């Protein structure tokens, strides 16, 4: 599908953020998990010759349900696609966590699957309310203080945090990615340290609003997929 | 064909000595239970019944229950239909009306 | 002489042994369960609950195959190991006086069959067969309250049911099982912090430690969280 | 419809002037992040 | 005069009825997406008793890419440049099933880092 | 084999419940398109959940698959509430089965699912192309035109039954009754995969 | 006669019992639908447990199949008020050397399954204010036919004109 032909020139390497397969844990079993995971394998092995991909689990796809969350290799893929990560180590696809510092020779950008701010934005909020332009600035705040957003953080039996790795880290990015909002929101704010662009990519059943990001004049471009 | 009575049938069932209105012996729906024998009971006999069609005595026409007691014969063209009553339009409709409530 | 809520069936083993579906008026429906006087002591709650559900099932629809599948399900719950662990809590009179409700929870079983009647620690952090077992004394002590109270007069042997049950991608399976009891343990943590909200003013981030340090001998979610955290050490 | 007529009008891109057995590779992507750092957020191999 | 494609579409439409979404055309011919748009237009132009019509995607974008279901209406795409015709469907709904397809011949735009067997 | 009647079970689940969906014998708002009812579906088939009803459907399919060589033609009969007369008779076949042969070869999972997806989509096509008038007041019943069967006497002859598998088997022969034995008939494209020849048609009135 | 008599007499006695339950000439919960099966069928077969009334219908079906050889068009009307038209006319049309025992025994299932398809799919006008009467020949009537008996030697048209 062509914008004749510039859409391919702008597009880079595929970035999902969380939500690889929606399901609810109390209603799922073995084979319906592999049905949606092998259709995800169909999608990713379909797009992997065209565009390389970087994948991350973490809210409702299988996870630790924590911000430092072990990304699940070898389960998202069929046997056709399983041997590619063995063949290519991290180039065409690698398993990355809910936060990751994607650095383009110093264009460091942070990802969040969304649950980290969506629980604050809808689930646990009785106060601090004077709804996209409100919820856009909650992850601005969570960027600014680098702090404990969620209600069950870091959620590990062994080695949760060894005084090196905060779940919302201390090294700042140029763009934070957070996901699964009702509407699209994309502003940029400059701070005394750096410049940070605000990225709120919406959940795909809420009309998609699927986004280009960065790296030419640090500019983002959404497109309505509905 | 002059019938018997109208509601006094229950009184007549009490009159020969039967229960006036029968209350059911609790029954195995699955016949693999009862340890597959009605003889499995306590010191006295309780003879626990079963509503499943394998363990049913037939209808006792007069003094005898009847089966064919013979060889079933295969047929060459024969259409066989299913005998369970399906869930209706009304049952699924009221069930989906029950989901908001 | 009042009328006072007659019963459709009635189990009648003994003096002061009632149980029926009592109901005062014909206009009422779902007739009220009556548990007065009944022989069915310490009164470990699982026997009472299975006897109540068994009577509710036997009495609402008058059928016994559902009793079969329910009792077989309960023997799977003991055998495979889905135990709520409030199911068995004994208490000696070892220290009117209330030096009682002592920690003694025999659902644990024995690893080596070594300690005689010493399933004592109710929060003992170890693996599967020191929290659940099949062949012991309390399987006899759970198969007798149905049999003596209810199954005597009907003749069916629940001991024969126990005898019939006493004998009779995988890394992704372990993964999705970890997801299952991870969501279950997070639901237990949610229940525990909503329970422990009465001691914070409105705060929610320090709710996790106070939720983890709640210790009742008797709470219907606490023991499930104990075995949830028994799992996460593996 | 006239939607098909728009395709009839746009005959200028016969094949987009691509060879179409030539893949024009687009991006020289660097991705310095992937190999020469530990990811802090990632697990511990001894823990796993 | 490329009827070599058209009969292949004809079996998949008719002798069995699984819809083509895109990928059967690129598998069969390895023609351009503009040329695939021309081919699907030609199939639409040389339609004889289609059981049901396809719906198009629209090339005119205006920061929107929408499958047309208000076929008579012009859903926010009024000054329309073009449409790419695909998803010819027998059924009530447009769902295909999705499958791995040969792509080393068929990949229009290859990987920035080409995969290595290593 | 083992995998082949799983495929037959899924194919009959799709066929039966799709006929149930397009006849509006159950309300369409209870249906949702899905891939998982206890197994992997080839297509997104509109399935109402309704666990009594899906228990009935997998019950009937496990009944039909229990015989598996007497049946040359499974079918679905359509009866109005108004009359017992057949409204439609959707044809299916169990002809030249792998299971009767018990041949191990060949699996061809994607190819058999391909031909199943074709036969399902044909069922979709000739189920929208007849119109919707009197969309309520329709019901469902099964019919099997089979080559050589009679099992219903197995309830009789003073048999003593001990195992749950043959409890099920006596339920299979108990549930089936021979009936007493045209106006229009329409074509449907069947699956033509090698071991599973399912030559499926439709009948109208 | 000729070996269809036994399964025909049990078929009419069970047909009468099913009419007695599902159109509630007697009280509906005055039966036992549990422990009797008529033929190898799943569904409940609710005979009145009354010994004098089962003997009454025993003599009824025994005498109508005694007069089978020249019997006329058979029916059962349920009456409490003025209707004056037959309700359930299971017409026993006498045929006539075909050896059909197993096949006719299977055939009385589908006759009785057409009966229960008429019975469970049947509305409710009033509870217990009706009485049946066997007869050989509610605002408005309605026509409904059920399955035939072509596999059987004697054909039974099995019409049921409700109300
Ligand atoms: S475990 Fe403790 S904190 Fe949690 S709900 Fe029970 S009593 Fe409350």
Residue numbers in the entry:
A (entry chain F): 244 to 373, 391 to 486
B (entry chain A): 525 to 625
C (entry chain A): 1179 to 1218, 1221 to 1275, 1304 to 1376, 1423 to 1488
D (entry chain F): 0 to 47
E (entry chain G): 1 to 118
F (entry chain E): 2 to 182, 196 to 219
G (entry chain D): 2 to 97, 106 to 146, 194 to 219
Question: What does the literature reporting this entry say, word for word?
Answer:
The translesion synthesis (TLS) DNA polymerases Rev1 and Polζ function together in DNA lesion bypass during DNA replication, acting as nucleotide inserter and extender polymerases, respectively. It belongs to the B family of polymerases and is composed of subunits Rev3, Rev7, Pol31, and Pol32 (24, 25). The Polζ subunit Rev7 is a hub protein that directly binds Rev1 and is a component of several other protein complexes such as the shieldin DNA double-strand break repair complex.
We then used single-particle cryo-EM to visualize the structure of the pentameric apo Polζ holoenzyme comprising two Rev7 subunits and one subunit each of Rev3, Pol31, and Pol32 arranged around a central canal. We obtained a consensus 3D cryo-EM reconstruction at 4.11 Å resolution, determined by the golden standard Fourier-shell correlation (FSC) method at a cutoff of 0.143 (29). The five subunits of apo Polζ organize into a ring-like structure. We can also identify the cryo-EM density of the [4Fe-4S] cluster in Rev3, which is essential to the catalytic activity of Rev3 (31). The channel opening sizes of apo Polζ and Polζ states A and B are 18.2 Å, 20.6 Å, and 20.7 Å, respectively. When a DNA oligomer is present, K1214 moves away from the pore and leaves space for DNA binding. Within the Polζ complex, the two subunits of Rev7, Rev7A, and Rev7B bind the Rev7-binding motifs 1 (RBM1; 517–540 aa) and 2 (RBM2; 599–623 aa) of Rev3, respectively.
